[PDB]
Design a protein around this nucleic acid. Structure first.
Ligand SMILES: [Mg+2]
Ligand SMILES: [Mg+2]
Ligand SMILES: [Mg+2]
Ligand SMILES: [Mg+2]
Ligand SMILES: [Mg+2]
Ligand SMILES: [Mg+2]
Ligand SMILES: [Mg+2]
Ligand SMILES: [Mg+2]
Ligand SMILES: [Mg+2]
Ligand SMILES: [Mg+2]
Ligand SMILES: [Mg+2]
Ligand SMILES: [Mg+2]
Ligand SMILES: [Mg+2]
Ligand SMILES: [Mg+2]
Ligand SMILES: [Mg+2]
Ligand SMILES: [Mg+2]
Ligand SMILES: [Mg+2]
Ligand SMILES: [Mg+2]
Ligand SMILES: [Mg+2]
Ligand SMILES: [Mg+2]
Ligand SMILES: [Mg+2]
Ligand SMILES: [Mg+2]
Ligand SMILES: [Mg+2]
Ligand SMILES: [Mg+2]
Ligand SMILES: [Mg+2]
Ligand SMILES: [Mg+2]
Ligand SMILES: [Mg+2]
Ligand SMILES: [Mg+2]
Ligand SMILES: [Mg+2]
Ligand SMILES: [Mg+2]
Ligand SMILES: [Mg+2]
Ligand SMILES: [Mg+2]
Ligand SMILES: [Mg+2]
Ligand SMILES: [Mg+2]
Ligand SMILES: [Mg+2]
Ligand SMILES: [Mg+2]
Ligand SMILES: [Mg+2]
Ligand SMILES: [Mg+2]
Ligand SMILES: [Mg+2]
Ligand SMILES: [Mg+2]
Ligand SMILES: [Mg+2]
Ligand SMILES: [Mg+2]
Ligand SMILES: [Zn+2]
Ligand SMILES: [Zn+2]
Lengths: 98, 103, 67, 55, 114
RNA sequence: AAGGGCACCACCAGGAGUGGAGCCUGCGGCUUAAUUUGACCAACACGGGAAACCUCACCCGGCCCGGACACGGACAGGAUUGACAGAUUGAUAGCUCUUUCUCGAUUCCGUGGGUGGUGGUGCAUGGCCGUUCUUAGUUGGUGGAGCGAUUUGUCUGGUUAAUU
RNA sequence: GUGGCGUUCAGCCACCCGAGAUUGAGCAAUAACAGGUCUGUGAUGCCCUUAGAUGUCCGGGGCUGCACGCGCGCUACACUGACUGGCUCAGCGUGUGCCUACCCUACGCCGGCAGGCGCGGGUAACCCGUUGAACCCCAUUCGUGAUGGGGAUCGGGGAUUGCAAUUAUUCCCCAUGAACGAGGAAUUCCCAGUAAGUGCGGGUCAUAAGCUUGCGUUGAUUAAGUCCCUGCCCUUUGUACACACCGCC
């Protein structure tokens, strides 16, 4: 996957700040609907977390035409080493409420 | 004191006749002038399907339908005391939508 | 299984070794060789081409027909 | 790629730009009332949407 | 306030909302004797209860798997942030609803039993 | 073969027809680079199949990787990504070819191994539907009859649209 | 309820009073089938193919080509009608769409017509809409002539949808005026608001119904039986059948 570096970190840092992210299964979409700011299309985000599933860093599920993803405990420690974050920052799924 | 119109939409009548009667005596107990439940004509939605996944068969169609019941209540109340009349009966099949008075 | 041409072999980049756009003289002399681009994205940044006639910036694709 | 002719044919009007919301198929589609499903995937979710075969 | 929609189109888009949610959470809480939803839509926080049998798994590691199943709903279906919440109930008489026992027979056959 | 009963997808009594003509449309056949294909009472205005493109499989050409991940090379002395012009092309596919610029570790090259598929087999299957079959039909427990397969209950008769 | 027949049982027939003395459908057992669908599916097993790909995209073509055979239909063969003008009544129902661009349309003006340009209303018992539907009805022309029946074929022109209309998208106009005089052997539906005539919605739909699914509208002939034909259900009986009479031999 060609996928420039600015186009990659902006997917992972939203895949880190929430433990999940949801993309639609169509490769012909100009922008990702939630991201929509760094000019990232739906084809890069579908091929980001195909690399993470093959490395076990994420878990997927596919309802009708939407991929959903979930950080595993291996993926949390990897994103704290690739995004270069201090070893106390957690995703929102670990603690927001009680 | 306003002239407000509550609209009640549902898909089953026995779950709507309980909610709509709750709003009537709920405002007859709180001494308001309530125009009664006005019943709109229902809306049946009649998708008809071939029933077969392939094209082979004896051409047996499949008539699905869904009636939509809509009843409306017109009140004579200010904007405050209707809120505890509105928020005491959800009954999830009923979508209580309260409009505004002046319009 | 027709085989009219058998191959349409893909482009290979000619892989030039070093950078070497500048020069050096009298123990220190700044001297460009290729033209710079006047665009805002690469002003005094990347260089323009030097073809048989023209100059051409590879980033913003504008070229000037050197007649 | 490339970008100018990868998906350049206009997927406006026509059944090449209408897909089932469940199974992404382009034949036998029901677009009435904003269903936008196929005619077979409707019959799985006919009761879950809330249609009743009364007659 | 953004755009009005017809009553014949509103009830279909609401009934096909829960038809997708029931199918998705059949996939997730597949092994938890799932048995359906009950979606309470208000013009406020819309709670969606889950009727799974083994509530020890839908509530994750200190509530992990129910705080990342609300975050997929409001990011897909268009709900605003901090609005929707999922619950986790327990059905009584687990061997009396079929949507829990067909999956229960499923993992007997997937485990290798005759 | 005999005795009962039943149904306008059976007839009688009839009504409108169809079979004839023109066109519409679906199949076989022929033809074609292709005329994609399924189905032969229970196939043939059926696949909700009224296809200009898309659908679209099929035919003739041209890009693209949307080949995860692992391993070994290659490599900041730049792995590689784009592209104006001429030519080239159906084409404003930098698709190749000249020409040099640009990109910056994401790729590339091999060995594995995915992945995709309106590809095959409905005689490997699920599901769903049609039909046998729109008629009234089907089964256990205990007891009786039998060596047994099985049978009585589930019936001579009357009655009913109906083991009513 | 009343009368009649019946073992006076289950019931049936007639009759009164009544809106009605059988309104239509929906669901639908056991046991089966090598019935159809892998081209509905991120339902799927094995197999095949995977970069000169059976992946996917783009451009063009094909699915619609025609000595012929067959199936469902539409329009007809006219006077119980076509034509023109006037008159006058419906019922189902849809309508601006997450992606998604594509909504039903009143009224005013321009054009012969299809249509165009302006201004609105309607997310709808609110606006289109009192849905001024067709057949029918009333009056005129026609006059038994392949005729003013029938409108196939075909040329020229004008618009609309669209990225694009040629192998004609549809529509309008003026011309062209073909068989067809009620249908051989066969054969298909149907018994009451039914058959049939007659239009209007919905589905498909950017453009669009000779299709289908619904709706009203005008509204009968015949029959209240039978097992003769085609089959079905139960019982007795015959069998050399069990792949079960398309059997076996
Ligand atoms: Mg017959
Ligand atoms: Mg007869
Ligand atoms: Mg006829
Ligand atoms: Mg005929
Ligand atoms: Mg013929
Ligand atoms: Mg004929
Ligand atoms: Mg063909
Ligand atoms: Mg086959
Ligand atoms: Mg039959
Ligand atoms: Mg095509
Ligand atoms: Mg060039
Ligand atoms: Mg290239
Ligand atoms: Mg393909
Ligand atoms: Mg497939
Ligand atoms: Mg089969
Ligand atoms: Mg089967
Ligand atoms: Mg049966
Ligand atoms: Mg016994
Ligand atoms: Mg017996
Ligand atoms: Mg018997
Ligand atoms: Mg008897
Ligand atoms: Mg078979
Ligand atoms: Mg299937
Ligand atoms: Mg397969
Ligand atoms: Mg389908
Ligand atoms: Mg094509
Ligand atoms: Mg065809
Ligand atoms: Mg047919
Ligand atoms: Mg005429
Ligand atoms: Mg009316
Ligand atoms: Mg004539
Ligand atoms: Mg064309
Ligand atoms: Mg067409
Ligand atoms: Mg004319
Ligand atoms: Mg239409
Ligand atoms: Mg059709
Ligand atoms: Mg009879
Ligand atoms: Mg007989
Ligand atoms: Mg038989
Ligand atoms: Mg004998
Ligand atoms: Mg015998
Ligand atoms: Mg012999
Ligand atoms: Zn520049
Ligand atoms: Zn579908």
């Amino acid at each position: 996957m060609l996928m420039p570096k600015k186009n990659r970190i902006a997917i992972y840092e939203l895949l880190f700040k929430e433990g999940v992210m949801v993309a639609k299964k169509d490769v012909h979409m100009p922008k990702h609907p939630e991201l929509a700011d760094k000019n990232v299309p739906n084809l890069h985000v579908m091929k980001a977390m195909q690399s993470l599933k093959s490395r076990g860093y994420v878990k997927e599920q596919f309802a009708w035409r939407h991929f959903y993803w979930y950080l595993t405990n291996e993926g949390i420690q990897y994103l704290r080493d690739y995004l270069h974050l201090p070893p106390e920052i957690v995703p929102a799924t670990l603690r927001r409420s009680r | 004191i306003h002239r407000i119109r509550i609209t009640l939409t549902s898909r089953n009548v026995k779950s709507l006749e309980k909610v709509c009667a709750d709003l009537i005596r709920g405002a007859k107990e709180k001494n308001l002038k309530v125009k009664g439940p006005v019943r709109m004509p229902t809306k049946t939605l009649r998708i008809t399907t071939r029933k077969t996944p392939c094209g082979e068969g004896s051409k047996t169609w499949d008539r699905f339908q869904m009636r939509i019941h809509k009843r409306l209540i017109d009140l004579h109340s200010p904007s405050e005391i209707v809120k505890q009349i509105t928020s005491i009966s959800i009954e999830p099949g009923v979508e209580v939508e309260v409009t505004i008075a002046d319009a | 299984y027709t085989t009219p041409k058998k191959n349409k072999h893909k482009r290979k980049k000619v892989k030039l070794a070093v950078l070497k756009y500048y020069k050096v003289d009298e123990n220190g002399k700044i001297s460009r060789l290729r033209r710079e681009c006047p665009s805002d994205e690469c002003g005094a940044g990347v260089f323009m081409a030097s073809h048989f006639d023209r100059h051409y910036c590879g980033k913003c694709c504008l070229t000037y027909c050197f007649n | 790629g490339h970008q100018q002719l990868y998906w350049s044919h206009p997927r406006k009007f026509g059944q090449g730009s209408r897909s089932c919301r469940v199974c992404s198929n382009r034949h036998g589609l029901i677009r009435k009332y904003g269903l936008n499903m196929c005619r077979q995937c409707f019959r799985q979710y006919a009761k879950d949407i809330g249609f009743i075969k009364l007659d | 306030m953004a755009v009005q929609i017809s009553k014949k189109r509103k009830f279909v888009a609401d009934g096909i909302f829960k038809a997708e949610l029931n199918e998705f959470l059949t996939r997730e809480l597949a092994e938890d004797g799932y048995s359906g939803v009950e979606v309470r839509v208000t013009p406020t926080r819309t709670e969606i209860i889950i009727l799974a049998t083994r509530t020890q798994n839908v509530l994750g590691e200190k509530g992990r798997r129910i705080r990342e199943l609300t975050a997929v709903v409001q990011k897909r279906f268009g709900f605003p942030e901090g609005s929707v919440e999922l619950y986790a109930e327990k059905v009584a008489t687990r061997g009396l609803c079929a949507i829990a026992q067909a999956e229960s027979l499923r993992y007997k056959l997937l485990g290798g039993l005759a």
